[PDB]
């Protein structure tokens, strides 16, 4: 069980750990959060009382290094820093558990809605969509830009996804236009898995780390790009059979997590409509369909 | 964007621009079997592909064979006129391929758009126009050109025939489409005002006969009165 200790907390904060949050007030005696558990990626997110503008936040995993945060108050947010002297960092935990002042990551024995939400996600993977290698740990907030974004403005706060188009010519074989553009299979098996991302984990986890960003955050174009990852694989004839049957647990455990109110801004209608209904894999996601109708029939 | 009536003499400045017209490429008749069932029998089709500063008329004629064993006729048919088109772009003079194709049903701009991938400074655009282009098979020498086609064939035509030599192009795209709605809202009664003086002749060349300035503003004025007729007759006004 690994640990995330604080300088202090001198402003006003909403924090969050995954999937919860806890609010701690200007100055509270507050030092960290332990117990978190061992074998996943996390991220420790932040909400100001103040400015509720930019949440923003840090991917980690606590196996590659001491992580801790503290708060710059000349760029005004909570930072996310290595430690690279274990002796003083082992020491401050210590120090620390002893007088109770780090919240115990609060996670049920039963629970897995962590584990299924990060399943095909890599701290590795995460370090090649958002650039800066100097640190082993991966800042994102609501207002950074995908590189799509950008081609339709600074590179080095981009969020690096994989450009998905589907009237482009990486998706559309000369001579095939008609069958490529209602069949999306050999963009998908070919260009993409074996091309691009080599494997169908490497896709799932990009897809993963997209949802996250876009409910987390309200990244906007993270929620695109969920969105092309899920519509791509929808619109193809041909997926490999387990890759479906991982698909309906992936989604579902997303639309189980998802604030029912935040439905209305991070599902884009036409896409699940699309997808549930009209595509060639309307029949395979039997889980996530069930729990769209009883959750969010509105929307369909 | 959409090219609408705001924006109409965009059509007769010198920035080369092709419509296109699908409405008659998929032509059936419906019919019914030895068993009481219903079956389709497809006949010749045409691409109408129109440059509307010039009247040059790029015909496409689509051959029954095209739809052999093919399954979703419909669909095909959008994605059949989008290679056609393209082949078209392609087959032309760079100087001579146009900048803009404006389609006239939307459901022709995915297919277009996909086939024209590799002409991204050719902009790919609807209209907000209802324009009367499915009415071409109603002039009778396109219709026979179709009809009698035993194979795939491009045919060239100028839809304004001579009259560029005394009006401009909008005025000339303004009488087609007059022509054109009356014989698409009533055409026996369109094709009798048309040829009703059998001294005005249609010259070998030509598709439409041979008027003067005073007998066109005659023709337009009885073509405006049938379109609003049948708009009575219709309505009951
Ligand atoms: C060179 C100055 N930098 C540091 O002292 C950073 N060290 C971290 C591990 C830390 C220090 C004190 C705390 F109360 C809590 C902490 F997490
Ligand atoms: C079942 C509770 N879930 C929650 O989101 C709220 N639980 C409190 C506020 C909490 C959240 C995170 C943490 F690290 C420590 C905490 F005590």
Same mark, same amino acid.
């Given at each position: 069980m690994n640990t995330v200790p604080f300088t202090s907390a001198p402003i006003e904060v909403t924090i969050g750990i995954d999937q919860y949050s806890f609010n701690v007030k200007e100055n509270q005696p507050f030092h960290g959060i332990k117990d978190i558990p061992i074998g996943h990626v996390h991220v420790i997110h932040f909400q100001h009382a103040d400015?509720?503008?930019?949440?923003?936040?840090?991917?980690?995993?606590?196996?590659?290094?001491?992580?801790?945060?503290?708060?710059?108050?000349?760029?005004?947010?909570?930072?996310?820093?290595?430690?690279?002297?274990?002796?003083?960092?082992?020491?401050?935990?210590?120090?620390?558990k002893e007088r109770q002042m780090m919240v115990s990551y609060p996670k049920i024995d039963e629970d897995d809605t962590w584990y299924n939400l990060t399943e095909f996600v890599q701290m590795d993977k995460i370090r090649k969509i958002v650039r800066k290698d100097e640190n082993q740990f991966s800042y994102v907030d609501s207002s950074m830009t995908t590189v799509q974004e950008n081609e339709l403005s600074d590179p080095?706060?981009?969020?690096?996804?994989?450009?998905?188009?589907?009237?482009?010519?990486?998706?559309?074989?000369?001579?095939?236009?008609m069958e490529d553009f209602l069949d999306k299979s050999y963009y998908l098996n070919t260009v993409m898995l074996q091309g691009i991302f080599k494997?169908?984990?490497?896709?799932?986890?990009?897809?993963?780390?997209?949802?996250?960003?876009?409910?987390?955050?309200?990244?906007?174009?993270?929620?695109?790009?969920?969105?092309?990852?899920?519509?791509?694989?929808?619109?193809?004839a041909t997926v490999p059979k387990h890759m479906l049957d991982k698909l309906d647990e992936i989604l579902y455990y997303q639309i189980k997590t998802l604030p029912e109110q935040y439905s209305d801004i991070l599902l884009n209608e036409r896409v699940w409509n699309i997808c549930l209904y009209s595509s060639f894999q309307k029949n395979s996601l039997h889980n996530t369909e069930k729990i769209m109708e009883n959750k969010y029939p509105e929307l369909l | 964007g959409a090219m609408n009536s705001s924006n109409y003499a965009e059509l007769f400045n010198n920035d080369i621009k092709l419509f296109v017209d699908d409405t008659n490429v998929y032509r059936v008749t419906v019919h019914?079997?030895?068993?009481?069932?219903?079956?389709?029998?497809?006949?010749?089709?045409?691409?109408?592909?129109?440059?509307?500063?010039?009247?040059?008329?790029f015909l496409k004629i689509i051959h029954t064979s095209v739809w052999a064993g093919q399954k979703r006729l419909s669909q095909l048919a959008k994605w059949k006129t989008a290679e056609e088109v393209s082949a078209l772009v392609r087959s032309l003079p760079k100087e001579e391929q146009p900048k803009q194709i404006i389609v006239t049903r939307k459901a022709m701009l995915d297919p277009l758009e996909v086939?024209? %991938?590799?002409? !991204?400074? *050719?902009? $790919?655009?609807?209209?907000? =126009?209802?324009?009367? /282009?499915?009415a071409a098979m109603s002039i009778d020498k396109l219709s026979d050109v179709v009809?009698?086609?035993?194979?795939?064939?491009?045919?060239?035509?100028?839809?304004?025939?001579?009259?560029?030599?005394?009006?401009?192009?909008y005025?000339?795209?303004?009488?087609?489409?007059?022509?054109?709605?009356?014989?698409?809202?009533?055409?026996?009664?369109?094709?009798?005002?048309? %040829?009703?003086? !059998?001294? *005005?002749? $249609?010259?070998?060349?030509? =598709?439409?006969?041979? /008027?003067?300035?005073?007998?066109?503003?005659?023709?337009?004025?009885?073509?405006?009165?049938?379109?609003?007729?049948?708009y009575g007759r219709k309505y009951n006004v």
């Open positions: 400015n509720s503008s930019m949440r923003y936040g840090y991917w980690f995993d606590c196996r590659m290094g001491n992580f801790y945060i503290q708060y710059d108050p000349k760029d005004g947010l909570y930072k996310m820093m290595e430690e690279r002297d274990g002796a003083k960092f082992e020491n401050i935990v210590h120090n620390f080095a706060h981009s969020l690096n996804y994989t450009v998905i188009n589907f009237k482009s010519r990486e998706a559309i074989r000369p001579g095939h236009e494997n169908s984990s490497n896709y799932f986890g990009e897809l993963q780390f997209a949802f996250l960003n876009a409910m987390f955050f309200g990244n906007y174009g993270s929620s695109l790009q969920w969105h092309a990852m899920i519509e791509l694989i929808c619109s193809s | 019914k079997t030895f068993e009481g069932n219903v079956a389709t029998k497809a006949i010749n089709g045409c691409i109408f592909t129109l440059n509307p500063k010039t009247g040059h008329l086939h024209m %991938l590799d002409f !991204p400074n *050719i902009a $790919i655009r609807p209209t907000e =126009l209802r324009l009367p /282009f499915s009809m009698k086609a035993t194979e795939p064939q491009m045919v060239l035509f100028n839809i304004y025939d001579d009259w560029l030599d005394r009006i401009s192009s005025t000339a795209f303004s009488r087609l489409t007059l022509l054109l709605r009356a014989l698409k809202t009533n055409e026996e009664s369109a094709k009798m005002i048309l %040829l009703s003086d !059998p001294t *005005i002749t $249609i010259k070998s060349y030509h =598709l439409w006969p041979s /008027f003067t300035d005073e007998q066109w503003i005659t023709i337009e004025s009885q073509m405006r009165d049938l379109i609003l007729t049948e």
